[PDB]
Design a protein around this ligand. Structure first.
Ligand SMILES: NC(=O)c1ccc[n+]([C@@H]2O[C@H](COP(=O)([O-])OP(=O)(O)OC[C@H]3O[C@@H](n4cnc5c(N)ncnc54)[C@H](O)[C@@H]3O)[C@@H](O)[C@H]2O)c1
Ligand SMILES: NC(=O)c1ccc[n+]([C@@H]2O[C@H](COP(=O)([O-])OP(=O)(O)OC[C@H]3O[C@@H](n4cnc5c(N)ncnc54)[C@H](O)[C@@H]3O)[C@@H](O)[C@H]2O)c1
Ligand SMILES: NC(=O)c1ccc[n+]([C@@H]2O[C@H](COP(=O)([O-])OP(=O)(O)OC[C@H]3O[C@@H](n4cnc5c(N)ncnc54)[C@H](O)[C@@H]3O)[C@@H](O)[C@H]2O)c1
Ligand SMILES: NC(=O)c1ccc[n+]([C@@H]2O[C@H](COP(=O)([O-])OP(=O)(O)OC[C@H]3O[C@@H](n4cnc5c(N)ncnc54)[C@H](O)[C@@H]3O)[C@@H](O)[C@H]2O)c1
Ligand SMILES: O=c1[nH]c(=O)c2[nH+]cn([C@@H]3O[C@H](COP(=O)(O)O)[C@@H](O)[C@H]3O)c2[nH]1
Ligand SMILES: O=c1[nH]c(=O)c2[nH+]cn([C@@H]3O[C@H](COP(=O)(O)O)[C@@H](O)[C@H]3O)c2[nH]1
Ligand SMILES: O=c1[nH]c(=O)c2[nH+]cn([C@@H]3O[C@H](COP(=O)(O)O)[C@@H](O)[C@H]3O)c2[nH]1
Ligand SMILES: O=c1[nH]c(=O)c2[nH+]cn([C@@H]3O[C@H](COP(=O)(O)O)[C@@H](O)[C@H]3O)c2[nH]1
Ligand SMILES: [K+]
Ligand SMILES: [K+]
Ligand SMILES: [K+]
Ligand SMILES: [K+]
Lengths: 342, 342, 342, 342
């Protein structure tokens, strides 16, 4: 009577199993794919959010081997200009977002004319007739444009996007840090299972999966890749960097920047699907990426994964309980110094 | 040796799976049934509680497409008068509660004479000889009166109520926010399983199930409907509105109203089965309903549920762990603004 | 490789399922057995602890239909005198504790001479050669003395005690509120499973099981009985009453009494297996018993259990998750008044 | 699609089952093995950490029947001198650590010349070509030197170490109190399962398993042994003792010592895998060992384990839920005095 499809898992439900290794962290190969036609030197892309990615962060991230997605909460002229600013900064790639609603044809044309490398239809509605037909329309108009459609969280959603013509499948319905879709609507799929379910289909086509949302610690990047993702999209992890939009706010001896959902009231201007918040100031993006990729390298040394494909297709998990996750964190000790990756 | 019937689930144990959709939130159809003979434009009814539903809230709720149940903690004359006040307010429907104990015949007669649309026998003892024979007596005296009996939490309880002649089955033993039945007695069934178990029987008869208690967020409304309920009954979600009984209380810069169980000592005047509390002031009921139904509409857009029946009979769940629920909430960020639906 | 016998449950893992009922709380029959030869009017006995049971509480409890166990942390003459004081208070029954170590023969003789109704060998070592041979020695010396041996937590422990000649089996290794055996030693069995496992054996002999430790709320009493216990032993629930030993301590506007484990350093005067604490002052034992038995009566009304035997042998459980237990408690509301049973 | 090998358990997921006993705590035999050739009078060894083990603690621990591992964060001359200082203190055994990287030949030679009893290659990379070939090189150079290699967390890791020539297998990837490997990398195995998996292989060879990390309470020592370990390695439990390195720090009326991971930035001088912290001051190591071994003795009395081998090979577990662990701790009472083992 209760129509329950299966028990789905998230990052804190699993750990990666150490295995025979010939890999040292400094020899690990971090290269991967965003699409069949767009390679990345590291498996990180930035969220299309108004508190994460404008040209400044997109440039810095691309210089580190990732790609940024310029957010849609600005005029067409402004967004095209940001794309152009990244493109003229010496051989760098950039993406840009547009919404799922009809009437974005002019915006897409302007972004393409500005040299955008990949268009994102930025939505939770990947498995909808509207988004699928938007993808088909876009693929007709731009036969050689790399396209990522709305997010999905299932095998059938991934298949539908692929059949519509996307270049990569992005996975995540409500796992975001600043996000309340799952609470407001009741809808979502724990992210590890969501990634694996999508990958089971996408792998058949050689189409990359992008794991979007819920990444808190560098270890979550490893887990997302092992679940089947070719790369991760992050908001919180990059929010609060110097390069992210917004000024640094001093409060009670500590520094912060604003970070908000794109379905928050502030971002939309209504029934919101995110909140408005503040996040500790992180310093420069370069050091954050170094910390995060250091964790992933150390993972690859422990799992014996020479490349991201090895991690993505060969590494094994164990299922854990809540006590297992409490043991994984610091426990039974007072932390006197905050570590740069914790 | 341990007589354990099965593992039962509640709202936070499950999420709804996104599916193919042709539904936009503004095209979703929220109409449903309270009984075979009483339709609702939205799937919400208010609790028969002395801190939730008197005529003022019953009127406002009926104007929004729901129905209120006037509580029993007042004299017969007062309760009939409240019913009458809702009935003369332009085409509005109303319910009213009576207790399970013998001797309520005069009260029932007065409520019927005042034009009550549906009588509720307001109790946790739906599966008891007393309540079942009270239903039979009432159905004999008023062959055309819509009747809802005591609450149940099982398939057999639902069957018994149906065989006694009820017009809808209401489900919930102790899930309420302000309620302690399960702690004081040890008795209850997690609400998602309770709803599904009742619905498995009630569906055979075309008899609506009402999911009563434990609804905290709009996403819980979606889940209750998908578990099999035609509509939800809420106390906490409407307590604290301007229209609910009681005055607004200012304390340390914030406003509150009283909210208490009907088995609390205060409400009964003894071994209580609820507590007395205060709840943040919510403003006008209209905006709360708009927020809550906005969440449900957004659910229906994501699940592809065109109607409440589609959600109730076709949408699928996934089982989740505690980590999955922590990911669903806001996490790893400081909330600087409270959202109207969170 | 990991020798794991099975997954064991405690009170918060389960709820009782409501069933057809002809029972009202005021008609429920609370009578039960402590042993085949000692009946109780209510299913409650007090812990043999120096912060719970001396003559004053033993008298008050016996007047309410239970039995107290006078603790062993006093001289032989003092303990015999306390027994005598309960016996001369008009037809009342009393128990008394002795430790498991050799050399307690004189103490046992003095307690028997004072008229003790039941002797408890007060220990966690029920399944030990020493305790079993102590029981055999005692049964030889006093062929008609009701005897309860050391605690057990397994079927085989219960069988061994029965074969040694006990009159009741007491179950509980480390579930106590003030107790640390499970943390210090790593040994124990979650109490619901422990009770059921013991009862599976004891039921074959018609020998009562006493559920000792871990009872926090009245609903836990219901659950212990449904798991197979004929009655419960409580420390925390009665500590802090006016009748318990110790003076009332005022601190920051609230009143307390001391409550400590019998393996705490304070009680022993070493490697302790309990702690020293304070518990809120509860008032008179009579009102506490009324609240606790009111909860049990309300359970019996909901489960349709006319007698304690019906609850003990017929009522069904459902297994629940942590979300199910959070729903059972008060949730999402501020408690402005503390209820007498919560 | 999700490559999940099995559900793995940690200390708080399990309890030991009481069994028939002829063992009293004072008759329990605590003797065990560190290697086939090195016996221990108690099953405790100290972590090779710069805030746990230098000569002073190594001497005190060896006098109590354990063995200390002098940490590697000092010059060769200094480390050899510390070894020598323990060796000349009247018949005492000592170990010493070296890192996994090439170029430690001189350090090993100096430690051997100073009389070290056992060499530890102190690493998380036990299952790596580098560590395995380091073990082989060392075994070639010192055919009669007791060697422990890098840590492992799997059956295959244990087999590989054994085939390379180790004298004991040490188990633990990231369970440490002050440690963040699992969070930073995503890699690890809950410690109870890790120990059992290693032991399943090591038992075939008669090779001891050492359970390293995650031990918080004395009951965890019992559980590690029952999972298959011959002895435990502890950092937190001994940090903060008078004999551990570092001065006592007074802060707000309480005393502390520093305790930090060996992958913390402070210890390494970078992407750290531990943190820097402070731990409450514990007093002299002798009393801590007495408390911890008192807990283990009490376990052995309850499980009927006459020897450590009996506990290690015969004692049974039950799986528990989070409610079972909450019952095991102190609950529902205010602790007015801190117990020496809690
Ligand atoms: N990945 C997620 O779980 C998630 C969820 C909500 C919001 N968001 C973020 O917020 C922004 C808005 O995302 P969104 O579009 O999912 O939020 P949304 O559900 O508010 O939809 C936004 C617009 O798209 C159209 N739309 C609404 N429901 C639709 C449906 N069921 N099918 C097709 N089209 C529909 C409407 O025109 C609407 O104004 C984006 O920047 C996105 O990244 C993400
Ligand atoms: N849905 C729930 O889980 C729940 C539980 C307790 C109270 N309540 C609320 O509190 C109020 C009282 O509800 P209640 O009647 O369940 O509380 P209750 O158990 O206190 O019963 C109230 C009255 O009904 C009769 N009654 C008591 N036990 C009975 C039984 N086992 N069978 C038949 N009749 C019995 C008695 O005359 C009693 O005074 C109502 O407004 C109700 O909504 C709800
Ligand atoms: N039910 C429990 O889980 C539990 C646990 C510890 C203490 N206690 C309470 O504390 C008091 C002491 O109880 P306890 O005796 O279990 O604590 P314990 O384990 O400290 O034993 C106390 C005495 O009994 C003897 N003893 C010790 N270990 C034994 C063994 N393995 N087999 C046989 N005899 C042994 C010794 O002489 C010892 O001094 C009692 O009042 C009891 O209620 C209860
Ligand atoms: N048991 C654990 O889970 C754990 C984890 C991290 C650190 N530590 C502690 O911190 C210290 C450093 O331990 P570590 O060496 O595991 O930390 P690590 O991963 O930082 O490695 C330290 C050095 O060993 C070499 N190394 C790095 N990765 C390697 C790999 N994949 N295979 C082979 N060699 C590699 C490098 O030269 C590196 O500088 C030790 O004292 C150790 O006890 C323990
Ligand atoms: O449910 C949502 N409501 C929102 O308001 C919202 N805004 C962003 N997003 C999504 O969250 C991702 C960022 O997540 P993290 O901060 O966890 O990296 C992003 O990359 C998006 O997928 C939203 N999701
Ligand atoms: O166990 C109970 N003790 C009480 O004192 C009590 N009062 C109300 N109710 C029930 O709780 C429902 C309201 O629940 P929410 O606040 O969660 O919406 C209501 O609609 C009722 O079903 C009670 N349940
Ligand atoms: O592990 C233990 N260490 C102790 O120091 C201790 N003292 C009492 N007891 C046992 O706890 C029971 C009382 O438990 P409650 O307070 O939960 O009712 C009692 O009835 C005893 O079974 C102890 N258990
Ligand atoms: O992940 C790690 N990062 C670190 O920085 C670190 N330093 C020590 N160790 C390991 O932790 C063990 C001590 O653990 P406890 O404090 O829990 O006894 C030790 O015995 C080591 O196995 C580390 N692990
Ligand atoms: K850890
Ligand atoms: K979220
Ligand atoms: K509740
Ligand atoms: K306990």
């Amino acid at each position: 009577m209760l129509r329950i499809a299966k028990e789905a898992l998230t990052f804190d439900d699993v750990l990666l199993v150490p295995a025979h290794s010939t890999v040292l962290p400094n020899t690990a190969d971090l290269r991967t794919r965003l699409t069949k036609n767009i390679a990345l030197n590291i498996p990180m892309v930035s969220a299309s959010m108004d508190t994460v990615t404008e040209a400044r962060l997109a440039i810095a991230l691309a210089q580190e081997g990732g790609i940024g997605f310029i957010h849609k909460n600005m005029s067409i002229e402004q967004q095209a200009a940001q794309v152009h600013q990244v493109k003229i900064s010496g051989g760098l790639r950039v993406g840009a977002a547009v919404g799922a609603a009809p009437g974005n044809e002019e915006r897409v044309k302007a972004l393409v004319e500005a040299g955008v490398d990949v268009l994102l239809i930025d939505s939770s509605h990947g498995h909808s007739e509207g988004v699928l037909q938007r993808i088909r329309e876009t693929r007709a108009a731009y036969p050689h444009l790399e396209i990522i459609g709305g997010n999905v969280a299932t095998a059938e959603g991934a298949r539908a996007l692929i059949e519509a013509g996307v270049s990569a499948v992005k996975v995540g319905i409500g796992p975001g840090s600043i996000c309340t879709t799952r609470i407001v609507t009741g809808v979502g799929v724990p992210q590890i299972t969501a990634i694996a379910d999508a990958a089971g289909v996408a792998n058949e086509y050689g189409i990359p999966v992008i794991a979007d949302g819920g990444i808190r610690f560098s270890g979550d990047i490893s887990k997302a890749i092992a679940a089947g993702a070719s790369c991760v999209m992050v908001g919180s992890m990059f929010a609060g960097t110097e390069e992210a939009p917004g000024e640094v706010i001093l409060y009670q001896g500590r520094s912060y920047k604003a970070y908000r959902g794109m379905g928050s009231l502030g971002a939309m201007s209504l029934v919101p699907e995110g909140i408005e918040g503040r996040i500790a100031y992180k310093g420069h993006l370069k050091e954050i990426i170094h910390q995060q990729m250091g964790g992933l390298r150390s993972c690859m040394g422990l799992t014996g994964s020479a490349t991201v494909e090895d991690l993505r297709t060969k590494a094994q998990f164990v299922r854990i309980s809540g006590a297992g996750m409490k043991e994984s964190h610091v426990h039974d000790v007072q932390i006197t110094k905050e570590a740069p990756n914790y």
